[PDB]
Design a protein around this motif. Structure first.
Motif, mmCIF file in Angstrom:
data_model
loop_
_atom_site.group_PDB
_atom_site.id
_atom_site.type_symbol
_atom_site.label_atom_id
_atom_site.label_comp_id
_atom_site.label_asym_id
_atom_site.label_seq_id
_atom_site.Cartn_x
_atom_site.Cartn_y
_atom_site.Cartn_z
ATOM 1 N N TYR C 3 0.822 -1.203 0.000
ATOM 2 C CA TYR C 3 0.000 0.000 0.000
ATOM 3 C C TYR C 3 0.860 1.259 0.000
ATOM 4 O O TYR C 3 1.273 1.740 1.055
ATOM 5 C CB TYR C 3 -0.941 0.007 1.207
ATOM 6 C CG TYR C 3 -1.999 -1.072 1.165
ATOM 7 C CD1 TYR C 3 -3.096 -0.965 0.321
ATOM 8 C CD2 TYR C 3 -1.902 -2.199 1.971
ATOM 9 C CE1 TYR C 3 -4.065 -1.949 0.278
ATOM 10 C CE2 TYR C 3 -2.866 -3.188 1.937
ATOM 11 C CZ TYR C 3 -3.945 -3.058 1.090
ATOM 12 O OH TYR C 3 -4.908 -4.040 1.051
ATOM 13 N N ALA C 6 1.103 7.927 1.367
ATOM 14 C CA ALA C 6 0.582 9.165 0.794
ATOM 15 C C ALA C 6 1.655 10.205 0.455
ATOM 16 O O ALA C 6 1.945 10.449 -0.716
ATOM 17 C CB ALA C 6 -0.467 9.771 1.717
ATOM 18 N N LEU C 31 -2.967 4.651 0.281
ATOM 19 C CA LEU C 31 -3.571 4.304 -0.991
ATOM 20 C C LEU C 31 -3.162 2.896 -1.390
ATOM 21 O O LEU C 31 -2.019 2.503 -1.212
ATOM 22 C CB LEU C 31 -3.082 5.275 -2.054
ATOM 23 C CG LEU C 31 -3.411 6.728 -1.747
ATOM 24 C CD1 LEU C 31 -2.709 7.658 -2.713
ATOM 25 C CD2 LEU C 31 -4.907 6.901 -1.823
ATOM 26 N N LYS C 32 -4.102 2.142 -1.944
ATOM 27 C CA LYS C 32 -3.818 0.806 -2.457
ATOM 28 C C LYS C 32 -2.942 0.927 -3.702
ATOM 29 O O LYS C 32 -2.715 2.026 -4.213
ATOM 30 C CB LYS C 32 -5.120 0.086 -2.791
ATOM 31 C CG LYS C 32 -4.997 -1.393 -2.806
ATOM 32 C CD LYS C 32 -6.129 -2.032 -2.053
ATOM 33 C CE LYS C 32 -6.073 -3.532 -2.238
ATOM 34 N NZ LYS C 32 -7.163 -4.215 -1.511
ATOM 35 N N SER D 25 -17.009 8.363 -5.857
ATOM 36 C CA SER D 25 -16.364 7.772 -4.681
ATOM 37 C C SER D 25 -17.311 7.064 -3.730
ATOM 38 O O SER D 25 -18.221 7.682 -3.162
ATOM 39 C CB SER D 25 -15.587 8.830 -3.913
ATOM 40 O OG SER D 25 -14.433 9.203 -4.633
ATOM 41 N N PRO D 68 -6.994 -0.926 -7.729
ATOM 42 C CA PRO D 68 -7.065 0.171 -8.691
ATOM 43 C C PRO D 68 -6.784 -0.156 -10.160
ATOM 44 O O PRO D 68 -6.267 0.707 -10.855
ATOM 45 C CB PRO D 68 -6.024 1.150 -8.156
ATOM 46 C CG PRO D 68 -6.157 1.010 -6.714
ATOM 47 C CD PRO D 68 -6.389 -0.472 -6.469
ATOM 48 N N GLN D 105 -8.785 4.528 -7.545
ATOM 49 C CA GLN D 105 -7.946 4.666 -6.363
ATOM 50 C C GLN D 105 -8.654 4.115 -5.151
ATOM 51 O O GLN D 105 -9.877 4.280 -5.025
ATOM 52 C CB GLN D 105 -7.649 6.139 -6.142
ATOM 53 C CG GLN D 105 -6.300 6.429 -5.560
ATOM 54 C CD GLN D 105 -5.916 7.866 -5.805
ATOM 55 O OE1 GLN D 105 -6.203 8.757 -4.987
ATOM 56 N NE2 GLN D 105 -5.293 8.114 -6.961
ATOM 57 N N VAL D 106 -7.910 3.469 -4.254
ATOM 58 C CA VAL D 106 -8.545 2.964 -3.046
ATOM 59 C C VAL D 106 -7.845 3.526 -1.832
ATOM 60 O O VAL D 106 -6.641 3.417 -1.702
ATOM 61 C CB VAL D 106 -8.617 1.428 -3.022
ATOM 62 C CG1 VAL D 106 -9.331 0.948 -1.784
ATOM 63 C CG2 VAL D 106 -9.354 0.928 -4.250
ATOM 64 N N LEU D 107 -8.610 4.187 -0.975
ATOM 65 C CA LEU D 107 -8.046 4.828 0.201
ATOM 66 C C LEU D 107 -8.457 4.065 1.432
ATOM 67 O O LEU D 107 -9.642 3.999 1.775
ATOM 68 C CB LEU D 107 -8.496 6.285 0.338
ATOM 69 C CG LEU D 107 -7.803 7.050 1.476
ATOM 70 C CD1 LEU D 107 -6.857 8.119 0.936
ATOM 71 C CD2 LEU D 107 -8.800 7.658 2.453
ATOM 72 N N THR D 109 -7.696 4.129 5.380
ATOM 73 C CA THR D 109 -7.180 4.976 6.448
ATOM 74 C C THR D 109 -8.009 4.700 7.672
ATOM 75 O O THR D 109 -9.080 4.096 7.586
ATOM 76 C CB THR D 109 -7.346 6.469 6.123
ATOM 77 O OG1 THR D 109 -6.064 7.100 6.123
ATOM 78 C CG2 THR D 109 -8.221 7.165 7.146
ATOM 79 N N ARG D 121 -12.968 4.850 -5.289
ATOM 80 C CA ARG D 121 -13.357 5.815 -6.315
ATOM 81 C C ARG D 121 -13.205 5.236 -7.732
ATOM 82 O O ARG D 121 -12.093 4.880 -8.150
ATOM 83 C CB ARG D 121 -12.540 7.091 -6.104
ATOM 84 C CG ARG D 121 -12.286 7.966 -7.293
ATOM 85 C CD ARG D 121 -11.326 9.074 -6.890
ATOM 86 N NE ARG D 121 -10.535 9.528 -8.027
ATOM 87 C CZ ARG D 121 -9.406 10.224 -7.932
ATOM 88 N NH1 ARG D 121 -8.914 10.556 -6.742
ATOM 89 N NH2 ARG D 121 -8.764 10.584 -9.036
#
Ligand SMILES: [Zn+2]
Ligand SMILES: [Zn+2]
Ligand SMILES: [Zn+2]
Lengths: 266, 114, 44, 134, 65
Positions: C3, C6, C31-32, D25, D68, D105-107, D109, D121
């Motif tokens: 991963y 950022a 982020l992936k 998203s 992604p 994109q994959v977030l 967190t 997204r």
């Protein structure tokens, strides 16, 4: 020679200003159409993308790739993938090319169509090379990279027709004009005070005789002379756009003839 | 999402003949050919040349809907003259003008500079 | 698996129960990373 | 082109006239209740784990999220999550029924309560079709 | 975004013209109409493709990631 009649006025790598005497309107038109939508060409039509850390989106790039003019001179000895008996693509029916770009510098690294690298076996055919009329030799600005940016992808160019997508369009613009004094009254000029002083004179008026007010309307007359100018993108030289155009039109008139014989069978 | 594929303009489909000939029921000695996967490029050229044959009484084409690459040609000929021959002589006539056009253009091209 | 961080470029292949944030940064927000099973695009 | 409609040059369109990118998203989060209760991000298996959708989970990696690159469409599951109610109950997030596109994109967190949460997204390019308002 | 691979209207290739345009402007002080003419962009269908274009990429590269 015999019927329809050609007269080059100007010629160049990119343009053929000519005059097409003794032809039907219909034919001189049908030719321009064919020249626009029906002479085949090679153009990128698949993009497999390995890495794109670029500012632009995948398909957004993929798109531009399609628009980059690839050499299509020997196109007639490449095949339609739909036709060819292989599964997916091959070397008979498709050129494959590679794009590698990585930003090394601090300065912005550009990616041109020169950076395109043929990979499949052209086997002698004059095909697939990106057209470059650019002066410093890098035609077309694919993309821009910042420092750590990479873009790695593979494009399979196929034989296509502009009817199917305007990428495969060999013609750019095809100027076209007949009867430059409206002697056939094919328009009725909109005016305010004076048709003549307000509408500017077509350059093709030095080539015909102005009418006489002492003359009445020639009603028997037809449209005869035609002033064209074919401009080529470059995936096919100019002369060839017109020729292959006449060739293709003729070719497709023919399959209609043949098709009539196919039906006669019992 | 509901769009037809774009090859469908020039590729024929599941058992669609290129030409389809039908006897016109209205006027005698008249016929109406359907041209699948073609347009004004062809139709206007065939119809305008059929108008030069002086044994052709009637000749006109039409694209019944722009969604579809196809058009109808209607042909009426004088008694004794079968309309298909009127189509045949018509096509050929074009092909000959086109050939002459090609060679005439070539010789002209071979005389230029730049 | 991995991963990319950022504000930091890396492939912190950290799993669950390892939680955030990352290594050698201090900012949590991972982020992936792009898949391997590459996709195709019709260039149209 | 009558009655406030218009005719667009299909040819021009192909060269990228009025083309847009379209990013959507989706977003999900691990529970919000309990001390011995926590919804988990995972790719569930229909084995007893009822509450399964109609779409394939097959595009979900082991952590319960797409990568992604993957094209998605129809009712593809994008975020896999199970709520363990006393085996499990599904709480996975299908891509919008009428949409389709490619994961951008994959977030992953954490949230201010120490909750793992995710923002997926998706990306579509949208080309001017018949009936699009200009 | 970035120059256009080709003009939407006609089909002419305007993508190789961008840098050459920007140079004609600043390097030898030409005016955009003249600059556009030297690039052989005659017809105004493809002339506006360059003049009306905005290079948002220069801004996009500004972001580190
Ligand atoms: Zn093949
Ligand atoms: Zn970090
Ligand atoms: Zn243009």
């Amino acid at each position: 020679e015999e019927g329809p009649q050609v007269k080059i006025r100007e010629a160049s790598k990119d343009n053929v200003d000519f005059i097409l005497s003794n032809v039907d309107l219909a034919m001189a038109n049908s030719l321009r159409r064919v020249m626009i939508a029906e002479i085949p060409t090679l153009a990128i039509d698949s993009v497999e993308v390995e890495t794109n850390t670029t500012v632009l989106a995948d398909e957004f790039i993929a798109h531009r790739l399609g628009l980059i003019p690839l050499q299509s001179m020997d196109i007639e000895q490449l095949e339609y993938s739909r036709d060819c008996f292989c599964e997916d693509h091959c070397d008979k029916c498709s050129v494959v090319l590679t794009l590698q770009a990585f930003g090394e510098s601090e300065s912005t690294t550009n990616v041109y169509s020169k950076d395109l690298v043929i990979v499949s076996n052209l086997m002698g055919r004059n095909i697939g090379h990106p057209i470059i009329q650019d002066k410093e030799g890098n035609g077309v600005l694919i993309c821009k990279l910042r420092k750590g940016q990479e873009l790695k992808l593979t494009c399979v160019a196929k034989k296509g027709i502009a009817k199917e997508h305007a990428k495969w369009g060999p013609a750019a613009a095809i100027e076209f004009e007949y009867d430059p004094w409206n002697k056939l009254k094919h328009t009725d000029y909109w005016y305010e005070q004076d048709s003549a002083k307000e509408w500017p004179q077509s350059k093709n008026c030095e080539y015909e005789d102005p009418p006489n007010e002492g003359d009445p309307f020639d009603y028997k007359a037809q449209a005869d002379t035609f002033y064209m100018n074919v401009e080529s993108v470059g995936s096919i030289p100019v002369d060839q756009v017109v020729v292959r155009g006449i060739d293709t039109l003729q070719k497709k008139v023919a399959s209609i003839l043949l098709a009539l014989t196919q039906m006669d069978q019992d | 999402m509901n769009a037809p594929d774009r090859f469908e303009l020039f590729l024929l489909g599941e058992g669609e003949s290129k030409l389809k000939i039908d006897p016109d029921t209205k006027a005698p000695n008249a016929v109406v050919i359907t041209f699948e996967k073609e347009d004004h490029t062809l139709g206007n050229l065939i119809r305008a040349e059929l108008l030069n044959d002086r044994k052709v009484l009637f000749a006109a084409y039409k694209v019944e809907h722009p969604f579809f690459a196809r058009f109808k040609l209607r042909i009426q000929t004088t008694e004794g003259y079968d309309p298909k021959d009127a189509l045949k002589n018509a096509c050929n006539s074009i092909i000959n003008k086109l050939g002459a056009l090609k060679t005439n253009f070539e010789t002209e091209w071979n005389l230029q500079t730049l | 698996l991995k991963y990319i961080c950022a504000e930091c470029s890396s492939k912190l292949s950290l799993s669950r129960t390892d939680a955030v944030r990352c290594k050698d940064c201090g900012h949590r927000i991972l982020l992936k990373a792009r898949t391997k099973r590459l996709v195709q695009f019709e260039a149209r | 082109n009558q009655e406030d409609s218009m005719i667009m040059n299909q040819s021009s369109i192909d060269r990228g006239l009025f083309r847009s990118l379209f990013f959507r998203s989706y977003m999900d989060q691990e529970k919000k209740y309990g001390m011995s209760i926590t919804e988990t991000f995972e790719k569930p298996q229909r084995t007893n784990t009822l509450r399964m959708k109609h779409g394939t989970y097959d595009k979900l990696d082991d952590d319960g999220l797409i990568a992604p690159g993957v094209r998605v469409s129809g009712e593809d599951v994008i975020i896999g999550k199970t709520t363990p109610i006393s085996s499990k109950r599904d709480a996975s997030t299908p891509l919008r029924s009428t949409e389709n596109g490619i994961v951008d994109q994959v977030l992953v967190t954490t949230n201010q309560d120490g909750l793992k949460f995710v923002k997926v997204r998706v990306r579509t390019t949208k080309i001017p079709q018949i009936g699009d308002k200009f | 975004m970035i120059v256009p691979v080709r003009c939407f209207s006609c089909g002419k290739v305007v993508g190789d013209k961008w840098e050459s345009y920007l140079n004609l402007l600043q390097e030898d002080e030409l005016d955009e109409g003249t600059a556009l003419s030297r690039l052989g962009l005659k017809r105004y269908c493809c002339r506006r493709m360059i003049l009306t274009h905005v290079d948002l990429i220069e801004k996009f590269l500004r972001y580190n990631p």
